[PDB]
Write a protein that binds this ligand. Structure first.
Ligand code: FMN
Ligand code: F3S
Lengths: 1472, 81
C-alpha cells in the first residue's frame, strides 16, 4: 500500500516529473501482496495533467485542425462482452455531449498489453476508450470545467437509469487525466505504453497502490478517484451518507442553476468510503471554494482546548465545525484541484506522511522516504506531517505554503472572529435561572410503581447506580456472563438488551479514551442544519450544548427558552387497543410529527409522561427510530430537531444506543427522582444533591466517550444516527424499516411478542398492589433469578467427578447439563446422521484427539503463579499445547527442574502492551500469538487494579510497583492491513521455527477481515466469542459486546472457502465450550482446534465468587497476597482426568454418530437439523443463514499443508552467510553495506542467531557493527540484542527500535549534506515501541508517538511531536528541540530532559501525573552531561557540540519532567 | 433442443408423470450442444406442480404445525459472491 504526490513549484511542464513519478511507483512492491500467480494485483493508479501537444498532433494526423484553445479527453470503460451495449453507451455519450454545443473530435482506442495481467483479473477487464472534445464557443475555462462536470454527471445518471451495468468514466476534464487499473503496480508502464512517449509532461502527479482485503477485483474501484487520493479507511461512513441525504434538499447555487435539479442524489450507489468522500468533495469544490477551505471543512483540525494557536484560526475552526460534520478515520489525503495541490493528514495523525524538497523547485511526498532516488546534496528540507497539518502548492503563481502561513492566508479571507460570538452557550442560561420552580418529587409508592412498570429491579439501583453517583465512574466486573441472550430470556428484558455495540479490528484502529481526550468532543448544535454551498451569517446563529445528555432543571430551562415552537408528543398507547395497538400507535405518531413539523414547529419533543393504568409507554427507542427515519425519508429532519425524555434508561448503554438512532438530546427524569429519594434517606452520607448529580453527569460523559472511542470515532456529531449496532432476535422487516441500516443476520420476533411482554409487565406492575422492588439476578445468581450457566449443583458435580476420577459421575454431569431448557444458540439444533452406527472399538485413540484441545492464556497479573504453573505443567505433561497470555512469564521456568516437569509454556502472546516481550522471551515457544482484541471486553486493553501489582509482577512486567496498569486499547503497530503484514513478517523473522496466530472476536462482516489476514501469511486464526472470562472490566463491556461465536465462525468458514483460502489457514474456536456435544458441534461447523478456559478452572477449584478484581479470591486462585495463596488445592491430575473424560465422551458420540475420525466430519454442515422450541414462544429464529455452505471442489475442507508458510528474506540472510567466525569461534566483525528502502526489518534474524548461540547479555557491547549507507527500510533493528551496533547514514523509515533489547542504534545524516541537523525530520512515527534495554542516538527530528511504552531504554533526539513519551514506564529520554502538544500522557516512571528556549513547555505539557521543574541536584546534572557527551562523541551533531561547549548558562534553560508517584521511591531527592 | 409436455387426462397426480418427464429429457441429448469439454451445455429445465405433501412433511419436521390450507413455495436466485 502507498500514496504519493510529486509537483513542480513554478509550473512549467517537464518530462522529469512523470519520470520520477513512474520510478517511485516502481518501488512500492515490498508493501504489496505478492501471491503465487505473481501476475494479479489489487489496483494501482497514476494521475497527471493533460498532454495537450500529443493529442493536438494526433488530431492533426487524423486530418482536422488543432484549435487555439485547449482540448478535453474523456476516458471511459465500456462493456466488452456483448456488442449490443457499446453502441448504446456511445449513443448516450454523444447525445449528451452534443446537446450543449461542444464539438466532438473523435474516438481513440488506447493501445494496451494484456499479456502481463493474470487470468482471474482478466475475466472482468472492461474495454478502455477515449473521446476528444474541444471548446469552440470561445467560453472561459472555468465555465468549460463546470459544464463538462455537469455533462459527465448527467451521462452517469442517464446510463444508470437503463440498468446497463459495467460502464465507468475515469475523469472528464481539460486539466487532469487518470491511468488506473487492476494490474500489478510495478508493470504500469507496460500496460499503458502511452506513458512511454517523450511528450506526457505534467506539473503534478499522483500515484497510489491499495491493499484490498478480499480477492475479487473490480476495475472501477481503483484509486485515485476524481480529484482526490486517499490511504486507509474512514470509520464514520454510515452516518455520513444519511446526513448527506438530509443536506441534499437545502442547497442551491446559481453556478448550477437549472441543471442543479439534475444533481439531487449526490452520493451514488456501490462505492467504497473514499468514493463517497470523493463525490462530496468534488460537488463541493465545483461551487467556488478552493481545496484548502474544503479540506478544513471536511476533515477539521482537532480543536485543541488551549491557547497554542492564534484565535483567528480558532474562530475559523469553530465555523468549519459548525458548518459541516467531520469525517474521522485514518487518512493521508493528497487532494489536487486544478489550481492548488494540498497534502494533509486527519485529526489524529495515525498514518505517516513525509515530504522532501529538492534544490530544483521540485516537491515530492509520500509514505516512504527512499522510493524515488534523490541526490544527497540537493535536498533543501526534509519534512514530515503531524495531526491536522497541511502543505499546499499553488501553481497559479508558483508558491509553496507550509502549515502556519497557509492557515493564516486562509483565515485572512473572512472576519471569522466576529461570527463566533453571535451564538450563545447554555451556562449563560443556567446561571440566570431564578431559584424557583421546584417540582414536588413523586411519592415513594409512585416511584416504585413506575419502576416496576419497567422491571427495574433493586440490584440495579445499588450495583451500578450507587458507585456512579458516589465515586464518579462506572462499576467493575470480574468474569464472563452466563445469562442467555435477550431473545431466549424469560423475564421482561429492556429493548436495549437486543443491541450489541460495535468495534473495529485491524481494519480500523481504535483510539484510547484516557490519554487523548483533547481530540474528542460531545458538542451538540441546535439550529445549525441548513445550507452547505452558500456563505452568510445565517449559519452562525444557533445554540451550543456541551453534553448531549441533560438534567431536569436544565431541560426545563431550555424548554422555557424555546418558547412557543416546541411541540410535545405523547409516547403512550392504550393497552386495550387490541392485538395490533402498537402498529396503530406508531402510525399515529409517525403521521402526527410530520403534520406538526410543517405547521410552523421547528422542534419535536417526544415525551412519555402520560403513562397511566390504561395507557402503557411505547418503547422510546422504537418510537425515536420510526420518527427519525420518517423525517429522513420525508426531507424534513433538517427542518427540525428531536429531544427525548425517557423513563427506562439508567446505565450508560441506553443513552448511547438512543443517540445512535438519530435523536439530538436525551433526558432521564426518573433517575434523578430516584437519586433524590435515595439522598434524602441519608444513604450517600453528607454529599449534597448538587455534587452527586454533577458526579453522575461526569460518569455518563465518561461512559459515552468510552463507548464512542470503542469504534474509532472522535466527535459525536458524526456518530448521531450512524447506526453502529448489531441486532439479534428482531424481524428483518422491523429493523430494515424502522431503523436506518442495521444488519440482522437472523430474523426474529416482530411487533407481537414485544407488545405482549410490555403489556404483561405493565399489568403485573400497575394492576396489582406492589410495595417492594424484586431482588432479581442479572449480574449475580439468585434463586428467583433466570437460568445462569454455572449452577451450584453443576460445579459441585463436576468437582466431585474430577476428584473421584469417575466416568459415571462425569456422564451424569454431562446429562445434567444437556437436560436444561435452551440457553444459547447451540441449544436450538440437533445432530442427525444417516449412516450405520460404528462400534466404539474402531474410532481413533484418546491421545490422538487429546492433542487438539488447549487451554487459553491467563495473565500472571490476574492469576496466582501457582495455578499458572499448574495449568502449564498439566497441559505440557500429556503433549498437548498450552498458553501463557499477557503479563510475561518468569525466565527461571524456561528449563525443567529435577522432577522432570517443565513449567515453560508452549505459546507466547503479543498483546498491545508488550510487557515481557524481550529477545529471550520470543525464542522459547513453538507458537506466537497476537492479541488484536480481547474476547470478554473487546475494544479495550488489559486492566489490573492498583494494589494487585506486587514486587514480583512488577519486576516481571518492568513497571513501578503500585499503579493501576491499563494497557492502551490501540495497538500502535497495526493501523491497517499492511502494518499487520509487517508485524507478521517481523515475528516470522525473529523466530525461524514457530508460527504466528491472530485472535479475533465475532461480529458481522468478519469474513472480510478474515480473508484480508489470510493474505498476510498468517496460518492460525483464533475466533473468540462473547462469553469468555477476564480479570477486570466494566459490566457494560461484558454484557454488551460481541456476538456468540456461531455466526462469526460459520461466516469466516464460508468466506475463507469462497476465495480458495481455507486450505492455507487453520481455524480454532473457543468461548463457552463445556461438554462434548458443543465440541462436536463446533468441529461440525468447521473448526479444528479448541479451548476450555473457565471450565478447566472449575476443575482447579474456582467457585465463581466473581470477586477476582479485589485480590480476595477465597479459594486462592486470583490472588497476589501471600495469605490467601496458601489455600490452594490445585492438582494437575484433575486436568488430566478432565481432558481424558472429554476425549472419551467425544469418541463415544462420534462412534454413535456413524463416522470414524474427526478429520472426516469438519465442514459437514448437513449433519445438523434445526429443531423448533415449539409454539410456546412464537419466536422465528431461523439459523439457516449459518448452515449454508459452498462446495469446496478439489482441495480439502481442512488445512492440508505441513510447516509454516514461507516468506521472502531480506538482506540480513546474506549477512549470516558472511558472519561465520562470529558463530564458529566468536571474533569481532565490522561490516558495511548499501541498504535500500525495500529491505524491511534489518538486523533481526542475526539477533535470533545470536540469542540462540550466546543469549542476551553474553557479549561485550559493540561486538559486531554494521554500517548501512542510504536510507533504511521499515522496522529497523527490531529486537536487537546487546552487542550489535547498527550505524545507518541517512534516515529511517518507520518503527525504528521496535522492542529494543540491549542493542545500540545510531542515525546520522551524510556528512556531506548541507542540512542543519535540528531543523529536519530523520525518523518516522512510533519510535522505540516496546523498548526495554538499549541506547538510541538520533541526529534529527522524531516522528509521532515517540518512545511509547519504554521500559528501561535511553534515547536522545532533537525534537518530537504530539503524544511524545505516551504512557512511558521507565528509562531516560533527552529531547533537544521543540516538544509537541500533549507530552508525557500517563507517564508513571522514568524521566524526561527537555531543552526549550521560548518557555513553551508549560504550554504543551500534560500536567496530570508529572511535574516539570528546573535542574537542582548535581547528580542529575552530571548524568545529563555524560549523556550529552556520549551523544556528541557518538554521532557528532553540531547543535549538541555547541550546547556542550557553553555549559554555564544552558542548564538553566533545561527542564526536567518527573512522574508524581515516583517521588517517594527515588534514592536521590530531586528537591533540596 | 426441444420442448415437451406430459399431462393426465383425468387430473389425478402420480409419480409416473415425473418419471416419464425425466425419461423424455434423457433422450434429447443429440440435438443439443456437444463440445470437446463434455460438461457444459446451454441450459434446460422442467416445470411441474407443487407436491404439497413433501413441503408439509418438511414443515412438520421443523417443529411447526402443518396448516390445512395450501402452502405456496418460492424459488429465488440470490447473488452468490
Ligand atoms: C481468568 C481469565 C483470565 C484471562 N486473561 C486473558 C488475558 O489476559 N488476555 C486475553 O486475551 N484473554 C484472557 N482470557 C480469555 C481467554 O483467552 C479465553 O477467551 C477464555 O478462557 C474463554 O473463556 P470460557 O472458558 O468461558 O470459554 C482470560 C480468561 C479468564 C477466565
Ligand atoms: S470468581 Fe475467580 S477468584 Fe476463584 S472462586 Fe471463582 S476463580
Amino acid at each position: 500500500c502507498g500514496v504519493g504526490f510529486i509537483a513542480a513549484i513554478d509550473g512549467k511542464p517537464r518530462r522529469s516529473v512523470v519520470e520520477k513519478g513512474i520510478e517511485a511507483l516502481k518501488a512500492v512492491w515490498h508493501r504489496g501482496a505478492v501471491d503465487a500467480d505473481g501476475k494479479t494485483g489489487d489496483g494501482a493508479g497514476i494521475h497527471v495533467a493533460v498532454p495537450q501537444k500529443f493529442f493536438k498532433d494526433h488530431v492533426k494526423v487524423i486530418g482536422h485542425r488543432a484549435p487555439d484553445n485547449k482540448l478535453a479527453v474523456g476516458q471511459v470503460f465500456l462493456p466488452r462482452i456483448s456488442l449490443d451495449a457499446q453502441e448504446a453507451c456511445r449513443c448516450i455519450v454523444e447525445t449528451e455531449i452534443l446537446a450543449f454545443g461542444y464539438y466532438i473530435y473523435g474516438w481513440r482506442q488506447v493501445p494496451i498489453n494484456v499479456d502481463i495481467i493474470g487470468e482471474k483479473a482478466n475475466a472482468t477487464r472492461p474495454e478502455i476508450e477515449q473521446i476528444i472534445v474541444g471548446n469552440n464557443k470561445g467560453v472561459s475555462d472555468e465555465q468549460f470545467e463546470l459544464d463538462l462536470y455537469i455533462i459527465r454527471r448527467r451521462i452517469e445518471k442517464a446510463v444508470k437509469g437503463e440498468q446497463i451495468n459495467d460502464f465507468y468514466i475515469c475523469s472528464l476534464s481539460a486539466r487532469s487525466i487518470i491511468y488506473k487499473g487492476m494490474f500489478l503496480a510495478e508493470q504500469l508502464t507496460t500496460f499503458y505504453p502511452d506513458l512511454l512517449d517523450e511528450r506526457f509532461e505534467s506539473d503534478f502527479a499522483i500515484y497510489h497502490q491499495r491493499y484490498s482485503t478480499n480477492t475479487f477485483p473490480t476495475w472501477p474501484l481503483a484509486q485515485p478517484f476524481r480529484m482526490l487520493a486517499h490511504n486507509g479507511e474512514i470509520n464514520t461512513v454510515k452516518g455520513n451518507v444519511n446526513w448527506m441525504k438530509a443536506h441534499e434538499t437545502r442547497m442551491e447555487h446559481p453556478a448550477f442553476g437549472t441543471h442543479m435539479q439534475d444533481l439531487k442524489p449526490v452520493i451514488g450507489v456501490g462505492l467504497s468510503d473514499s468514493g463517497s468522500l470523493d463525490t462530496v468533495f468534488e460537488v463541493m469544490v465545483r461551487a467556488g471554494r478552493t481545496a484548502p477551505m474544503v479540506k478544513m471543512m471536511l476533515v477539521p483540525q482537532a480543536l485543541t482546548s488551549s491557547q497554542t494557536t492564534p484565535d483567528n484560526h480558532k474562530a475559523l475552526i469553530q465555523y468549519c465545525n459548525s458548518v459541516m460534520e467531520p469525517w474521522d478515520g485514518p487518512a493521508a489525503l493528497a487532494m489536487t484541484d486544478g489550481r492548488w495541490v494540498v497534502g494533509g493528514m486527519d485529526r489524529n495523525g495515525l498514518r505517516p506522511m513525509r515530504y522532501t524538497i529538492t534544490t530544483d523547485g521540485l516537491i515530492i511526498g509520500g509514505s516512504e522516504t527512499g522510493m524515488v532516488k534523490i541526490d544527497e546534496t540537493q535536498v533543501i528540507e526534509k519534512g514530515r506531517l503531524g495531526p491536522g497539518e497541511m502543505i499546499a502548492v499553488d501553481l497559479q503563481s508558483g508558491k509553496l505554503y507550509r502549515d502556519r502561513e497557509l492557515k493564516d492566508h486562509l483565515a485572512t479571507l473572512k472576519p471569522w472572529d466576529k461570527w463566533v460570538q453571535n451564538t450563545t452557550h447554555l451556562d449563560e442560561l443556567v446561571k440566570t435561572a431564578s431559584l424557583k420552580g421546584e417540582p414536588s418529587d413523586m411519592d415513594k409508592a409512585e416511584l416504585r410503581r413506575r419502576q416496576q412498570a419497567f422491571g427495574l429491579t433493586m440490584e440495579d439501583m445499588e450495583l451500578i447506580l450507587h458507585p456512579m453517583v458516589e465515586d464518579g465512574k462506572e462499576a467493575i466486573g470480574s468474569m464472563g456472563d452466563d445469562s442467555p441472550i435477550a431473545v431466549l430470556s424469560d423475564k421482561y428484558r429492556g429493548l436495549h438488551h437486543f443491541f450489541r455495540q460495535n468495534f473495529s479490528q485491524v481494519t480500523n484502529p481504535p483510539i484510547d479514551s484516557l490519554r487523548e481526550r483533547r481530540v474528542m468532543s460531545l458538542k451538540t448544535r441546535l439550529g445549525n442544519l441548513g445550507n452547505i454551498l452558500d456563505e452568510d451569517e445565517t449559519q452562525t446563529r444557533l445554540l451550543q450544548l456541551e453534553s448531549p445528555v441533560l438534567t431536569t432543571a436544565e431541560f426545563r430551562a431550555m424548554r422555557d427558552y424555546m418558547g412557543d415552537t416546541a411541540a410535545e408528543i405523547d409516547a403512550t398507547f392504550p393497552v386495550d387497543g387490541g392485538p395490533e395497538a402498537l402498529r396503530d400507535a406508531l402510525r399515529r405518531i409517525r403521521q402526527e410529527t410530520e403534520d406538526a413539523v410543517r405547521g410552523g414547529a421547528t422542534h419535536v419533543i417526544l415525551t412519555d409522561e402520560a403513562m397511566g393504568p390504561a395507557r402503557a409507554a411505547i418503547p422510546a427507542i422504537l418510537a425515536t427510530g420510526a420518527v427519525h427515519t420518517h423525517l429522513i425519508r420525508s426531507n424534513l429532519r433538517t427542518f427540525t430537531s428531536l429531544n427525548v425524555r425517557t423513563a427506562e434508561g439508567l446505565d450508560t448503554h441506553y443513552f448511547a444506543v438512543l443517540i445512535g438512532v438519530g435523536a439530538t438530546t436525551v433526558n432521564a427524569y426518573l433517575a434523578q427522582e430516584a437519586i433524590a429519594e435515595r439522598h434524602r434517606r441519608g444513604l450517600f452520607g453528607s454529599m449534597p444533591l448538587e455534587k452527586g448529580m454533577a458526579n453522575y453527569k461526569k460518569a455518563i460523559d465518561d461512559g459515552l466517550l468510552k463507548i464512542m472511542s470503542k469504534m474509532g470515532i472522535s466527535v459525536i456529531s458524526s456518530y448521531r444516527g450512524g447506526g453502529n449496532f448489531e441486532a439479534i432476535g428482531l424481524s428483518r422487516a422491523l429493523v430494515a424499516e424502522h431503523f436506518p441500516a442495521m444488519v440482522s443476520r437472523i430474523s426474529g420476533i416482530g411487533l407481537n411478542g414485544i407488545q405482549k411482554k410490555v403489556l404483561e409487565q405493565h399489568a403485573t406492575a400497575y394492576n396489582e398492589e406492589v410495595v417492594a422492588l424484586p431482588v432479581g439476578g442479572f449480574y449475580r445468581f439468585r434463586k428467583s433469578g433466570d437460568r445462569h450457566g454455572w449452577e451450584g449443583g453443576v460445579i459441585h458435580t463436576l468437582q466431585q467427578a474430577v476428584t473421584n476420577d469417575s466416568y459415571t459421575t462425569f456422564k451424569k454431569y454431562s446429562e445434567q447439563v444437556n437436560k436444561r431448557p435452551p440457553m444459547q444458540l447451540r441449544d436450538l439444533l440437533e445432530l442427525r446422521s444417516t449412516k450405520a452406527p460404528v462400534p466404539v472399538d474402531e474410532v481413533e485413540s484418546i491421545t490422538a484427539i487429546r492433542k487438539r484441545f488447549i487451554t487459553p492464556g491467563m495473565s500472571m497479573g490476574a492469576l496466582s503463579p501457582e495455578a499458572h504453573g499448574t495449568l502449564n505443567v498439566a497441559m505440557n505433561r500429556i503433549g498437548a499445547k498450552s498458553d501463557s497470555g499477557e503479563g510475561g512469564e518468569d525466565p527461571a521456568r524456561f528449563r525443567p527442574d529435577k522432577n522432570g516437569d517443565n513449567w515453560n509454556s508452549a505459546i507466547k502472546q503479543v498483546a498491545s502492551g508488550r510487557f515481557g516481550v524481550t529477545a529471550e522471551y520470543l525464542n522459547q515457544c513453538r507458537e506466537l500469538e497476537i492479541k488484536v482484541a480481547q474476547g470478554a471486553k473487546p475494544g479495550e486493553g488489559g486492566q489490573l487494579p492498583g494494589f494487585k501489582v506486587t514486587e514480583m509482577i512488577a519486576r516481571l512486567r518492568h513497571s513501578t510497583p503500585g499503579v493501576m496498569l491499563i494497557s492502551p486499547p490501540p495497538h500502535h503497530d497495526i493501523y491497517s492491513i499492511e502494518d499487520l503484514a509487517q508485524l507478521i513478517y517481523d515475528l516470522k523473522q525473529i523466530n525461524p521455527d514457530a508460527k504466528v496466530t491472530v485472535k479475533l472476536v465475532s461480529r458481522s462482516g468478519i469474513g472480510t477481515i478474515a480473508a484480508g489476514v489470510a493474505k498476510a501469511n498468517a496460518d492460525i486464526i483464533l475466533i473468540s466469542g462473547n462469553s469468555g472470562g477476564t480479570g477486570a472490566s466494566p459490566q457494560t463491556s461484558i454484557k454488551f459486546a460481541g456476538l456468540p461465536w456461531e455466526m462469526g465462525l460459520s461466516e469466516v468458514h464460508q468466506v475463507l472457502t469462497l476465495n480458495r483460502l481455507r486450505h492455507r489457514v487453520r481455524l480454532r474456536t473457543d468461548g463457552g465450550l463445556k461438554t462434548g456435544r458443543d465440541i462436536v458441534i463446533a468441529a461440525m461447523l468447521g473448526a479444528e482446534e479448541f479451548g476450555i478456559g473457565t471450565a478447566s478452572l472449575i476443575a482447579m477449584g474456582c467457585i465463581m465468587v466473581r470477586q477476582c478484581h479485589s485480590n480476595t479470591c477465597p479459594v486462592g486462585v486470583c490472588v497476589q497476597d501471600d495469605k490467601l495463596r496458601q489455600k490452594f488445592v490445585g492438582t494437575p491430575e484433575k486436568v488430566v482426568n478432565l481432558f481424558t473424560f472429554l476425549a472419551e465422551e467425544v469418541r463415544e458420540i462420534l462412534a454413535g454418530l456413524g463416522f470414524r475420525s474427526l478429520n472426516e466430519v469438519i465442514g459437514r454442515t448437513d449433519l445438523l437439523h434445526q429443531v423448533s422450541r415449539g409454539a410456546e414462544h412464537l419466536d422465528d429464529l431461523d439459523l439457516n443463514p449459518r448452515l449454508a455452505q459452498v462446495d469446496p471442489g478439489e482441495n480439502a475442507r481442512y488445512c492440508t499443508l505441513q510447516g509454516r508458510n514461507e516468506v521472502p528474506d531480506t538482506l540480513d540472510a546474506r549477512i549470516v552467510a558472511d558472519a561465520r567466525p562470529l558463530f564458529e569461534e566468536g571474533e569481532k566483525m565490522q561490516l558495511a553495506y548499501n541498504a535500500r528502502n525495500t529491505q524491511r526489518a534489518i538486523g533481526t534474524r542475526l539477533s535470533s542467531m545470536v540469542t540462540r548461540k550466546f543469549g542476551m547479555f553474553g557479549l561485550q557491547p559493540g561486538h559486531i557493527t554494521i554500517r548501512l549507507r542510504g536510507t533504511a527500510g521499515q522496522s529497523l533493528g527490531a529486537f536487537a540484542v546487546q552487542g550489535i551496533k547498527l550505524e545507518v547514514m541517512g534516515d529511517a523509515n518507520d518503527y525504528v527500535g521496535k522492542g529494543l533489547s540491549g542493542g545500540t542504534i545510531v542515525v546520522r545524516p551524510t556528512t556531506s549534506s548541507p542540512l542543519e541537523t535540528n531543523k529536519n525530520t530523520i525518523i518516522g512515527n512510533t519510535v522505540l515501541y516496546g523498548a526495554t534495554a538499549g541506547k538510541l542516538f538520533a541526529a534529527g527530528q522524531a516522528g509521532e508517538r515517540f518512545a511509547v511504552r519504554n521500559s528501561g531504554a535511553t534515547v536522545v533526539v532533537e525534537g518530537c511531536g504530539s503524544n511524545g513519551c505516551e504512557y512511558m514506564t521507565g528509562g531516560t529520554a533527552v529531547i533537544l528541540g521543540r516538544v509537541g502538544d500533549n507530552f508525557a500522557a500517563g507517564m508513571t516512571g522514568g524521566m524526561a530532559y527537555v531543552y526549550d528556549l521560548d518557555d513553551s513547555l508549560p504550554l504543551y505539557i500534560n500536567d496530570e501525573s508529572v511535574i516539570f521543574q528546573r535542574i537542582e541536584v548535581g547528580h542529575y546534572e552530571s548524568q545529563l552531561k555524560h549523556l550529552i557527551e556520549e551523544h556528541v562523541t557518538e554521532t557528532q551533531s553540531r547543535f549538541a557540540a555547541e550546547i556542550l561547549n557553553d555549559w554555564a548558562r544552558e542548564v538553566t534553560k533545561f527542564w526536567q519532567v518527573v512522574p508524581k508517584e515516583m517521588l517517594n521511591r527515588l534514592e536521590v531527592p530531586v528537591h533540596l
